Write a protein that binds this DNA or RNA. Structure first.
Ligand SMILES: O=C(O)CNC(=O)C(=O)O
Ligand SMILES: [Fe+2]
Ligand SMILES: [Zn+2]
Ligand SMILES: [Zn+2]
Ligand SMILES: [Zn+2]
Length: 407
DNA sequence: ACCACCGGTGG
DNA sequence: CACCGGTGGT
């Protein structure tokens, strides 16, 4: 209840002040002090974008040291003094899965998806004018998104598998059952590993996604009781333009596991290239977690908060909209950088890291790669989610069979 | 409003 | 190659 600004929700969760969040996260993660970093971010509502307008970052929150284990972005709600005055927006576990696992997933998923992977077009693959080339213009190499598990379907108002006699949640090109089983095993195993981390760090969101686990098990991933996830998307060097995951269930979240190219697996030192995760409607604070101006200035000079970097680069523009050859034009971010209130708070997720955010409510995006290449990607993101209305047994078979019966 | 959306099956 | 039809967002 409230009687006292951006989307309001508390399932990640929330408290009367920044200090309360620290207690909450210290309790959840188990460690105290340095291990947990909290950045205050400010919702401006003014979207950061290039002149074209594709995703851009204005600030990059980077892991400060090996000591930093948990990053939490918090939004202090303008004018509130209640028990949910400050809410958690993003949680990032730098050391999310074992590094040997992360190395092995990188290789295996890249190899499997490049040869047997089947494309999944998405509106967020393109800018508003549907004329950009953020993915790269080589069909064999361009960044791409692949969708697996279950997903919601307007045609059934439920799982897309409502008619499927034994559906293939991990359909690869053509036929090969053995390749699909191998891909299934990796992502099933990873789903299984990630659930307890999700329970631990975002229990309220985890609990919501678990409610109907026993009613619709056919629409859940994972091999062990506690199955919050329904679908997985693999994004290889994919530039996701600013969007919200509107199909996701209410009061849940998305877990994003990041895998990086081999030149970007050591703490510190720059790889080139690098893909960023962006909240285009936020700016960073004047002040650090505990309210010190000097402290936040130190982070800026040390690079824990990297202040970008207005650019003027050259890029491709398609002569005709994709609509569901090209010319060079130069892209600019001068205007987003002129306005202190135009947002673009980004994080640089590491190899093996796990990012938690309410992707349904928060506008978000990933930056385009300099030279996208899905066959040897700079970044692979593994995005775990549950869509709305995935609460019926057997992929909603009964419902549709019954709805068509009355006709 | 109203355009435009992380597919599948039978034929 | 053609039916099935929910709903946020500028
Ligand atoms: O790649 C991640 O950081 C973000 N992924 C998405 O926003 C998505 O595919 O819906
Ligand atoms: Fe998304
Ligand atoms: Zn673009
Ligand atoms: Zn309040
Ligand atoms: Zn299903």
């Amino acid at each position: 209840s409230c009687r006292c600004e951006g989307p309001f929700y508390t399932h990640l969760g929330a408290g009367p002040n920044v200090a309360a969040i620290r207690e909450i996260m210290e309790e959840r993660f188990g460690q105290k002090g340095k291990a947990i970093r909290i950045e205050r971010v400010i919702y401006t509502g003014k979207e950061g974008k290039s002149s074209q307008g594709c995703p851009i970052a204005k600030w990059v929150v980077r892991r400060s040291s090996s000591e930093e284990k948990l990053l939490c972005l918090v939004r202090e709600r303008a004018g509130h003094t209640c028990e949910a005055a400050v809410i958690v927006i993003l949680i990032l576990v730098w050391e999310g899965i074992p590094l040997s696992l992360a190395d092995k997933l990188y290789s295996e998923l890249t190899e499997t998806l490049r040869k047997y992977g089947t494309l999944t077009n998405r509106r967020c693959a393109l800018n508003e004018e549907r004329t950009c080339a953020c993915q790269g213009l080589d069909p064999e190499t361009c960044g791409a998104s692949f969708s697996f598990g279950c997903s919601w379907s307007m045609y059934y108002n439920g799982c897309k598998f409502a008619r499927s006699k034994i559906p293939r949640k991990f359909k690869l090109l053509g036929d090969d059952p053995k390749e699909e089983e191998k891909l299934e095993s990796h992502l099933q195993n990873l789903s299984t590993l990630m659930a307890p981390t999700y329970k631990k760090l975002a229990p309220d969101a985890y609990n919501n996604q678990i409610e109907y686990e026993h009613r619709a098990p056919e629409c859940r991933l994972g091999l062990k009781e506690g199955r919050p996830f329904s679908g997985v998307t693999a994004c290889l060097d994919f530039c996701a333009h600013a969007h919200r995951d509107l199909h996701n269930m209410q009061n849940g979240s998305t877990l994003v596991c990041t895998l990086t190219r081999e030149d970007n697996r050591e703490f510190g030192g720059k790889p080139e290239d690098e893909q960023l995760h962006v909240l285009p409607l936020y700016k960073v604070s004047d002040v650090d977690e505990f309210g010190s101006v000097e402290a936040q200035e130190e982070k800026k000079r040390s690079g824990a908060i990297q202040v970008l970097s207005s650019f003027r680069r050259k890029v491709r523009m398609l002569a005709e909209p994709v609509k569901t050859g090209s010319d060079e034009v130069w892209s600019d971010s001068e205007q987003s950088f002129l306005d202190p209130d135009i947002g673009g708070v980004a994080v640089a997720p590491t190899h093996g890291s796990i990012l938690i955010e309410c992707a349904k409510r928060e506008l978000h995006a990933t930056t385009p790669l300099k030279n996208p290449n899905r066959n040897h990607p700079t970044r692979i993101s593994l995005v775990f989610y549950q869509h709305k209305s995935m609460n019926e047994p057997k992929h909603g078979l009964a419902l549709w069979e019954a709805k068509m019966a009355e006709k």
